[PDB]
UniProtKB/TrEMBL annotation, chains B, C:
It comes from the Eukaryota. Its cofactor is Mg(2+). This is Geranyl diphosphate synthase small subunit. The keyword Secreted does not apply. The chain holds residues 49 to 306 of 313 of the full protein. Signal peptide: none annotated. GO terms for molecular function: metal ion binding; prenyltransferase activity. Keywords: Magnesium, Metal-binding. It comes from Mentha piperita.
TrEMBL record, chain D:
Keywords: Isoprene biosynthesis, Magnesium, Metal-binding, Transferase. Belongs to the FPP/GGPP synthase family. The lineage of its organism: Eukaryota, Viridiplantae, Streptophyta, Embryophyta, Tracheophyta. One of its GO terms (biological process) is geranyl diphosphate biosynthetic process. Mg(2+) 3 binds at residues 89, 91. Mg(2+) 4 binds at residues 221, 225. Pathway: Isoprenoid biosynthesis. It comes from Mentha piperita. Mg(2+) 1 binds at residues 83-84, 89, 91. The keyword Magnesium applies. Mg(2+) 2 binds at residues 83, 89, 159. One of its GO terms (molecular function) is metal ion binding. This is Geranyl diphosphate synthase large subunit.
Length: 295, 248, 248, 279
């Protein structure tokens, strides 16, 4: 038996303990306050757990992956802060509380966000221990690539440039899903796989695996939006309807979307048949939580 | 100043071969435009000049100089984020592009590790630490942030000068110090150029703040030039005469 | 309790044979009354305990502990003008007496240099630097200042915790650190005590603020106690298990 | 022939450059800005000069006394900051501009002045170089005694508690003048004499000198007002007060005869200036 719950419970707590430790209050107090407001507001911490699990899978251990686990979560958090802004989604709720720019105003929100992006790299580069420099620089480079013009950012830009027309291309949409959400999941999986000493083929197989739960992640998120309320999700929801923004439920309804979800989750787990079933259990539990989470 | 213009252009050419517009045009077009519509920064040139002033070759700090420029470009784009004028790109695309420029900078550094030079891994790690910090919440962001508190003909020169130390200084200190590092200079040398950079960048920042809040006591430009040179002594070379020009 | 109470009393006795009311009573009356009407501070106590925890003699830290009490005392007086309650002396005599209390702290220290102890000078200079710093603009004053920005049921815990770190923490770390130094401890053990001190005082301050901000999450007093004790590991002596008292 | 003007200008420029360096902008920006607003407002810089001059008088050099010269200027600044407050003189202007609490709020002015006081000790203790630890510690102790309860502060407190009685005695008046003005002049001269390696009897002579010009200044101020609340002219007349002035001046310069007339020129020029000043 694998007790997923207890597991996520334990990793989440460890990650929240490291996060609070990494971003302390110091001058300028408001920039730091706004960083901590969004970063410790607490979400599922799926990415940090993907990173730690991948490192532990190939043999590494949690403490060498923790600064990297923190770094991806900080990058994740800064993309939500930026996403919620009046010039983006203009949302008022995130993670159970007012969006950052409502609590501190637009400017501190932009800046607090860029500071997180910056500190993610400083944090991985100066605190990672138990890995050789060439490895830590390789990891930093992979983080870069996963979050910029070929990653997270590319998906975000294409997404805002698609809200212009109701005329939705079938694969102007996959491009958005693979970059908007999958890219950073892969980055999390790879940073930890590399850090734990994973061999190239293990890394490549994990990459392919992250791409499936990544495409899955966005599909489930598009479902919950149109089937859950703001209070449940912790964020302003249903706005995918009040925005010419192509999501799967819109393009193929909710039932075919859920169907597509299980298909994705099954393909995900198929990819891990690569590893021993014992090593694989955390990832499999994580593939299932990403798939059946209620929020 | 022929030497600086060439340093300028070498940085530009490297960027240009590094940032290629490829499909999806919707993403790389803005990344290309904003990166070059950003005013060039002496923080980037200082980087190569300091590398050459200590003994290494320009090629030794191109990636850093390029990463330095990109960090400053994103802050520039993010500094101008209202519909103040019809910019070439909408506000969401510019905010996002800025977020995409910063990491590209770390991608250049990373991929610039030559496994033939035994000492690269470490020099580059430290350069990533110095660059992510100058660009972080305690450096340039400190500056972008307090800049908000200025009321032109009401705020003191002491306040303006500190926003200038955080907004421009820190990055220049970073450039100079990253070049020293990449050129294998010694810790004493690094601290000196670091300090040289902070003064230089603050003074430079005072020039772009002169274009509005002009009650700048000419002695504020004075002490800064003077503190900058009192810093360059103990150093020798062509660039030691040339760096000195950057301030007098 | 006998141990802690007897440390507080030794400090009170010492201050008492040191601050003698005498003509001009208009000056020493207030200097005496304000110094002993200020709540005692765990930063003075921590000074003697740390000194003894590392092997040295309580008497080696008395002037430092006295001095820390005085610095805290003056800041307290300055904090409590305006006329919130009842004062024995006017706002001007209190402002001026705080200004006389801090200097007397340094006088006590300087005058405690035994000239037959080759090691006094250096240790005492160091302590003067630490106490002047903990009490200056980057420490305590930084906290007395941000305190102004608090709003009963509006400002966050994170903010309040930082005000506590500056207002009280910095002073407790200085206390433990100075005791370590007067006691001849090693850099490693000074650093540990300094940190221990910082948390303990941050926590102590969070209590002084429990009585207003009832928002204080039981988890914050927990993270501090825990951070405090994590710090006391590697160290031993009864004060190594008695030091872990104000984290229970 | 000694150009006192130029002399004063060189020293002031040196001092201002070091004060500027010692007290920089950093968070909290407002506490620091308030410190600079008052500290770099510029002034005659008489106290840092006396410190530096006393140190070069006994053979020491300027760079060693500089932090202590900076320190006494900070303490003198903090004393003015506090004195201008509403619960004291309640003034709206000083040394050419709005007072510190008017520009930053009462709370920041009080704190900034506290920041100055303690930073004075941190600065002299960590930045002084070219002097042995016990020497630096002796100096910190001298600074302490001159600004506290047997110095500057006791002068201010006894003054404030005398504004009640329209009638006052002569040695109550002299007590205020010695602690209010002279105590910090003596501290200035002694930190320098001691930092320059001055022998104990050279220090003693400079102490006397500092007390006289200090007292002298007050006595002349009292004379100017009248020949243009208890004062010298009211207690002993203007003739006798003028007499007293010349006697203080004479006793000051007598103290300096021990030194090279060339090193003493500024201190002699200064005693004569405090004495015949048109205002
Ligand atoms: C669906 C996308 C692309 C982002 C939201 O991520 P999360 O749903 O992981 O939210 P948090 O748990 O961090 O709050
Ligand atoms: C992937 C990034 C950077 C942001 C989330 S895109 P989204 O607006 O669909 O997600 P949210 O509903 O706002 O959580
Ligand atoms: Mg969006
Ligand atoms: Mg959104």
């Amino acid at each position: 038996m694998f007790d997923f719950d207890g597991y996520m419970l334990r990793k989440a707590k460890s990650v929240n303990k490291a996060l609070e430790a990494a971003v302390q209050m110091k001058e300028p107090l408001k920039i730091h306050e706004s960083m901590r407001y969004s970063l410790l507001a607490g979400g599922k911490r799926v990415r940090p757990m993907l990173c730690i699990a991948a490192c532990e899978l190939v043999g590494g251990d949690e403490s060498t992956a923790m600064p990297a686990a923190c770094a991806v979560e900080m990058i994740h958090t800064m993309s939500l802060m930026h996403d919620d802004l009046p010039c983006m989604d203009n949302d008022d709720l995130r993670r159970g509380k007012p969006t950052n720019h409502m609590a501190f105003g637009e400017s501190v929100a932009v800046l607090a966000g860029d500071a997180l992006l910056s500190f993610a790299f400083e944090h991985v580069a100066a605190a990672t221990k138990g890995a050789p420099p060439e490895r830590i620089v390789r990891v930093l480079g992979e983080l870069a690539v996963s979050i910029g013009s070929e990653g997270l950012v590319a998906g975000q830009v294409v997404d805002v440039c698609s809200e212009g027309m109701a005329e939705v291309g079938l694969d102007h949409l996959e491009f958005i899903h693979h970059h908007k959400t999958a890219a950073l999941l892969q980055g999390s999986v790879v940073l930890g796989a590399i850090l734990g000493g994973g061999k190239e083929e293990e890394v490549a197989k994990l990459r392919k695996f992250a791409n499936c739960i990544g495409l899955l992640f966005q599909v489930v998120d598009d479902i919950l939006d149109v089937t859950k309320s703001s209070k449940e999700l912790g964020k302003t929801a249903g706005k995918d309807l009040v925005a010419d923004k192509t999501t799967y439920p819109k393009l193929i309804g909710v039932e075919k979307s859920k169907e597509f979800a299980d298909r994705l989750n099954r393909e995900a787990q198929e990819q891990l048949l690569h590893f021993h079933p014992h090593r694989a259990a955390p990832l499999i539990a994580l593939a299932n939580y990403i798939a059946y989470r209620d929020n | 100043q022929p030497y600086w213009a060439a340093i300028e252009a070498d940085i530009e050419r490297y960027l240009k071969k590094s940032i290629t517009i490829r499909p999806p045009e919707t993403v790389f077009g803005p990344m290309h435009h904003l990166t070059f519509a950003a005013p060039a920064t002496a923080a980037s040139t200082l980087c190569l000049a300091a590398c050459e002033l200590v003994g290494g070759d320009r090629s030794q700090a191109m990636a850093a100089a390029a990463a330095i420029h990109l960090v400053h470009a994103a802050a520039y784009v993010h500094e101008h984020l209202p519909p103040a004028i019809q910019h070439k790109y909408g506000p969401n695309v510019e905010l996002l592009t800025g977020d995409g420029i910063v990491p590209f900078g770390f991608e250049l550094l990373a991929g610039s590790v030559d496994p033939a030079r035994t000492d690269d891994p470490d020099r580059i790690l430290r350069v990533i630490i110095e660059i992510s910090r100058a660009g972080g919440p305690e450096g340039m962001i400190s500056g972008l942030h307090r800049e908000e508190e200025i009321v032109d003909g009401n705020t003191s020169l002491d306040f303006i000068e500190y926003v200038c130390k955080k907004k421009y200084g820190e990055m220049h200190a970073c450039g100079a110090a990253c070049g020293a590092i990449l050129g294998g200079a010694a810790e004493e040398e690094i601290q000196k150029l670091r300090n040289f950079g902070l003064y230089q960048g603050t003074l430079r920042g005072m020039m772009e703040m002169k274009n509005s809040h002009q009650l700048i006591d000419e002695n504020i430009i004075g002490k800064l030039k003077e503190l900058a040179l009192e810093e360059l002594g103990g150093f020798h070379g062509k660039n030691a005469e040339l760096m000195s020009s950057l301030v007098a």
